[PDB]
Design a protein around this ligand. Structure first.
Ligand code: K
Ligand code: K
Ligand code: ZN
Lengths: 351, 8
């Protein structure tokens, strides 16, 4: 049983030319990688190589206009980069961003291919920039291409179109791009837990509410778990996994689990304001490993406290290697869970 | 997403 790891310092080149201390920092990935080496997890993993996604692979989820626009930034002067970035919600662009977004997606392709062919059981991808806010036709929320959504489509393209892909997005923000790419799809089950605050938290859309259950034959395959009024932590996430995530996922019976593993719900995060501990992330990973015969690919999304993300992701990797989990309710969190249960009981007999 | 303005 082998755990894969992909990391490439070339993804550090994407940077914010006007604010070098912007929280989506190059050192997010180098700090996480360093922590894996300090905790001796690195030596226990099989290094999987990064690669660039092809433009053909990007078109599995994105429009040729969007691909062309981001590609065009590779050679722009600073004023053109500043103006292009301002055309999106919460995006900065440098001459290296496009290449970095290709390396993030291609890293996860090589990881998924390694998992699906049996070279490894599971894998962790320490990649930048993030992916889950990227839409088919636009960048958003520090994300250019939807790495996790592309990986699901990539996985199906090397196996069969009906490969059941579960994407669990525990980034504190709603993966709006992912939700929309798979909204009419019952082959990819999208489950997101996110701070919502009645729609006032980023990305600021009612799309992220519990009543958005999917469209068409995707009805029931989009599970939104939104948190309101409370600084949520391990009890709230544990309970949502026990009551919702794990019962639905078991019924779906995925053949590969992608985690959109943002760590901005972590204790200490400057954007999330939540308090999931590193031990909590270990328990969420350990639960997901009981699906798909442990075929889990943990993909870095957000997470902006360098110490918190480095400890939290390392614990997820520790779980992937087979380590036993370390030892571990707000009233409004019960309201949320009950609201999602009512919305999804019609499509999931486990509920 | 970052700034404090409300919809970023
Ligand atoms: K999320
Ligand atoms: K779906
Ligand atoms: Zn986030």
């Amino acid at each position: 049983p082998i755990t894969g790891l992909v990391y490439d310092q070339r993804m550090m080149l994407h940077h914010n030319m006007w604010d070098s201390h912007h929280p989506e920092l190059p050192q997010r990935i180098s700090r996480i990688f360093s922590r894996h080496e300090e905790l001796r997890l690195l030596s226990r993993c099989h290094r999987i190589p990064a690669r660039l996604a092809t433009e053909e692979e990007l078109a599995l989820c994105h429009s040729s206009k969007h691909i062309s626009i981001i590609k065009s930034s590779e050679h722009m002067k600073p004023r053109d980069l500043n103006r292009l970035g301002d055309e999106y919600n919460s995006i900065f662009i440098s001459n290296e961003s496009y290449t970095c977004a290709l390396l993030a997606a291609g890293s996860c392709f090589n990881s998924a291919q390694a998992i699906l062919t049996g070279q490894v059981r599971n894998a962790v991808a320490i990649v930048r920039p993030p992916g889950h806010h990227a839409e088919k036709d636009t960048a958003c929320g520090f994300c250019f291409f939807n790495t996790a959504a592309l990986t699901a489509r990539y996985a199906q393209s090397i196996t069969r179109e009906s490969l059941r892909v579960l994407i669990v997005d525990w980034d504190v923000h709603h993966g709006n791009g992912t939700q929309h790419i798979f909204e009419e799809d019952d082959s990819v089950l999208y489950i997101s837990l996110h701070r919502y605050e009645d729609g006032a938290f980023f990305p600021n859309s009612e799309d992220a509410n519990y009543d958005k259950v999917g469209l068409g034959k995707g009805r029931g395959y989009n599970v939104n778990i939104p948190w309101n009024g409370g600084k949520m932590g391990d009890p709230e996430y544990m309970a949502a996994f026990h009551h919702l995530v794990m019962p639905i996922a078991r019924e779906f019976a995925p053949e590969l689990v992608l985690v959109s593993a943002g760590f901005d719900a972590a204790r200490g995060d400057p954007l999330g304001g939540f308090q999931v501990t590193p031990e909590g992330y270990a328990h969420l990973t350990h639960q997901l490993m009981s699906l798909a015969a442990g075929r889990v690919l943990i993909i870095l999304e957000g997470g902006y406290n360098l110490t918190s993300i480095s400890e939290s992701m390392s614990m997820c990797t520790s779980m992937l290697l087979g380590d036993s989990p370390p030892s571990l309710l707000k009233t409004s969190a019960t309201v949320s869970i009950n609201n999602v249960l009512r919305a999804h009981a019609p499509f999931w007999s486990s509920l | 997403x970052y700034x404090x303005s409300x919809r970023v």
